[PDB]
Design an enzyme around this catalytic site. Structure first.
Site, mmCIF file in Angstrom:
data_model
loop_
_atom_site.group_PDB
_atom_site.id
_atom_site.type_symbol
_atom_site.label_atom_id
_atom_site.label_comp_id
_atom_site.label_asym_id
_atom_site.label_seq_id
_atom_site.Cartn_x
_atom_site.Cartn_y
_atom_site.Cartn_z
ATOM 1 N N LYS A 1 0.646 13.450 -0.488
ATOM 2 C CA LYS A 1 -0.733 12.976 -0.509
ATOM 3 C C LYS A 1 -1.692 14.020 0.049
ATOM 4 O O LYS A 1 -2.760 14.257 -0.529
ATOM 5 C CB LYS A 1 -0.815 11.651 0.246
ATOM 6 N N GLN B 1 0.856 4.796 5.745
ATOM 7 C CA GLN B 1 2.109 5.065 5.055
ATOM 8 C C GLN B 1 3.131 3.975 5.370
ATOM 9 O O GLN B 1 3.329 3.616 6.532
ATOM 10 C CB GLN B 1 2.646 6.435 5.470
ATOM 11 N N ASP C 1 -5.216 2.240 -1.231
ATOM 12 C CA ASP C 1 -3.950 1.751 -1.768
ATOM 13 C C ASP C 1 -4.080 0.418 -2.493
ATOM 14 O O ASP C 1 -3.120 -0.004 -3.151
ATOM 15 C CB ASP C 1 -2.893 1.596 -0.674
#
Ligand code: NA
Ligand code: NA
Length: 284
Positions: free
Chosen positions: A53, A97, A120
């Protein structure tokens, strides 16, 4: 002739657009989109995903802040950090994460991210908006799948689509995007009696369960579009999908390779969501 659904090439093409748009923003308004990334602990795979990322941000000129926390971090500390990222106007998107440690309530931590920064798409407000046809952040893997199909001019409306895997982060939101686009959608999983019943009828099969060779050529309709979301790290170091790619390409009309198919599209979708978050923040 089977067509490779070249997610890596599409992601690189989209990244070139993002890099150019961000360059313009930086010069016009002297700001850049910025992604906050929170990593808890030192899980090897999670470290790899965080690095993917961050490297993607670097490729397009997007700023980032990587906060690494110990595995024994308290929920209160994690929540206080998220609150500060939510209130910092220079932070465009906030990503935690996964997985988090067992002593942390993951659903509570994720719901603490402000929905306007939820790149997300994991906040229930955003999931609920997707399910009710209101525009907001899409989860990155389903977003990238739909974008890949759009690039290849794959029609969704009126088609029969089989989704293998019913997770909150892939299969369920993907099923909603497919339904919203007019497909008739079946969602299967470990308890399905006969997945081939659904896959043999399907114009589009998307599989993401983490089981090598689950989808075989004999389970497919001739000409089917096959989207392989699985990423399986075998014992010998190989990375294979959930589809028997070598044989399935004899029947499929379109098929994603693994690696370099859905994976790069998930990453670029996160970048696009962060830019969207920045742009909506500036207009508000
Ligand atoms: Na505060
Ligand atoms: Na369509």
């Amino acid at each position: 002739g089977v067509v490779l659904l070249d997610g890596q090439a599409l992601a690189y093409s989209i990244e070139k657009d993002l890099k150019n748009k961000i360059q313009i923003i930086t010069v016009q308004v002297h700001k850049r989109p910025k992604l906050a990334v929170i990593l808890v602990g030192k899980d090897p795979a999670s470290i790899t995903y965080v690095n993917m990322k961050i490297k993607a941000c670097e490729r397009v000129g997007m700023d980032f802040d990587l906060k690494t926390l110990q595995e024994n971090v308290t929920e209160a500390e994690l929540l206080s950090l998220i609150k500060d990222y939510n209130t910092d106007q220079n932070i465009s998107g906030v990503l935690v994460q996964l997985p988090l440690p067992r002593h942390i309530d993951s659903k509570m931590v994720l719901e603490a991210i402000d929905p306007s920064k939820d790149v997300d798409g994991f906040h229930p407000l955003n999931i609920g908006k997707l399910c009710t046809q209101k525009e907001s952040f899409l989860p990155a893997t389903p977003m990238g799948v739909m974008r890949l199909l759009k690039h290849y001019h794959i029609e969704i409306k009126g088609k029969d689509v089989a989704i293998i895997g019913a997770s909150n982060i892939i299969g369920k939101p993907l099923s909603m995007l497919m339904l919203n686009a007019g497909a008739s959608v079946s969602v299967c999983h470990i308890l399905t009696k006969d997945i081939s019943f659904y896959t043999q009828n399907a114009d589009i099969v998307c599989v993401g369960v983490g089981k090598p060779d689950l989808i075989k050529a004999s389970m497919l309709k001739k000409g089917a579009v096959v989207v392989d979301i699985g990423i399986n790290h075998l014992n010998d170091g190989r990375i294979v999908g959930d589809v028997d790619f070598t044989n399935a390409q004899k029947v499929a009309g379109f098929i994603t390779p693994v690696p370099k198919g859905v994976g790069p599209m998930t990453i670029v979708s996160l970048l696009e969501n962060t830019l969207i978050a920045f742009e909506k923040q500036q207009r508000k």
